[PDB]
């Protein structure tokens, strides 16, 4: 029983974590094979920052200025290139604990776990969910860059973002590994705030539905409803909208539970109307939304890896 | 910036685990050294839980009935000993993977990062607290005793808790590495009830003190209260009393606030009392109790 906000096994990402250092400027790396991966602004000085020019910056530097460090050893880079704003820096011995891994673009909605570096070494995991805005509300402080935030596909670790920058808000923006930000974001100093946010209602609905496997059950009403009549509640306390793909995703939980996802549309339509009786719900006296249906089968069902 | 319940990295403690299976029953062990450590209700069947005698019980069982697994790899298991609830299975080899490590037994109130294994491979990890009533409000399925919790002090992997038992409650206990429950719980089919609970003090004040640092500074009021009359509110409110030792281990943030222990021991006296007025604190409706005040250092101080 019991439900917590549960990450993947971090020991095959921890072996892949590594220091690069640019002149005065360090932070974290990925190696995977005989590539090391990091946020392109390693290469830039404060100076630089404000109006960078990272195709000429780039060049302007070579192997030798790029310090990469896997714990105490240090890996001679033999080659850099630029994949959009993640540096690819080609290294003279392959990592032997390389997993079995993918680059994958997540959707807004979705999770993944993230593991915070410094210097090269991890500090801690926690689980992450790309916001609709597509901000992430993580832990990082100054040399957390280049952490990166992955899924456990099974047998291979999908990896789905790296950390390049913290807004005003105190929010948090990256990209893909492709170098993609998620996101209107640039990793340039120039005016960015996230576009306002709302609650990813799929992954409240899997959270109720969690909350009826681990006893509680005293939100479950005898009301159901349509699914435009919710969308119409939802929208009306900014809600994303619950698409037929979302039901279908929470079969699932529906199947175990034997509630329809619309009974608990009306369920939840009803804790935004009258609000949660000054009760807890999986110890918690708002709707979390950062736990996919994924995350609710994955954490009730023992999946390994 | 930011604030969210982070655990440690499980690399250290990974490749540690494996899968011991005696008879029918299969949960997870810990390989340190050449010993691997499980809860020794492993040797019994549910038939035999309801009123096991583990001593007679390993009197019959043999090293060929132990079963380890570490991985695919079959690990030959060449004696085997009890110490307390916990079974020590001495094996052929030595884990290549055994980090430097300690055995500790946690107060009440201080935190660890629980790695849920089944069948010998990690499925996650998580933050808990060891309740004042020594339980825990973990996620356990079945097959996940041998499971174990534990803290990194920077090289250290300080093991301090395995998993053995889900409750009634829906909550969970379990032992120290030298086999001695937490709690006033047994290895057996017996009625069993945890005590009812109280809400860490400490742990919330320093919680308040992360929601400042991090810019939530609605709750703060400061009317200047007594170690003593905040007491007398708390205790009625199912708080645990605060020492001034508890006082001391939260100067540090309270120097990096400018904000008096007890001032805000005042914000949150009436924060007891009136309540929240409908707003948040880093993302709780709820005042969080699980957050130590090394923990949030820790996790606004950038360690590794
Ligand atoms: N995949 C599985 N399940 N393999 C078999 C392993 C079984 C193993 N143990 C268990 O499942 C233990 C056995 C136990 C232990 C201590 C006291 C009394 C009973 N079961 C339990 O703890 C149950 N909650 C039974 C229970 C209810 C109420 C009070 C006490 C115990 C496990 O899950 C840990
Ligand atoms: C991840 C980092 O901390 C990294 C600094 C590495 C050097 N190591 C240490 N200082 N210990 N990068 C930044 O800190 C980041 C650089 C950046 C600037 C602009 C865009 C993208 C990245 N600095 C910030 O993100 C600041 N918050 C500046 C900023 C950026 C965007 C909007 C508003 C402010």
Redesign the pocket.
Known sequence: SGFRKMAFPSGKVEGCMVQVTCGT???NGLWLDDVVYC?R??ICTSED?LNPNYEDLLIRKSNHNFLVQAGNVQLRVIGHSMQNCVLKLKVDTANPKTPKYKFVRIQPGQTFSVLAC?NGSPSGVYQCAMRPNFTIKGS?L?????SVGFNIDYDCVSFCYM??????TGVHAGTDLEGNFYGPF?????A?AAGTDTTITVNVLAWLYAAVINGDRWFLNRFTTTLNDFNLVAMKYNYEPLTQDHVDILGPLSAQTGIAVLDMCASLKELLQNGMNGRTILGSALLEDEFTPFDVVRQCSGVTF
């Open positions: 400027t360090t932070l946020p602004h390693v920052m410094y990082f100054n040399g957390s860059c280049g950390h390049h920058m913290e807004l005003p640039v990793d340039r100093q120039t960015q």
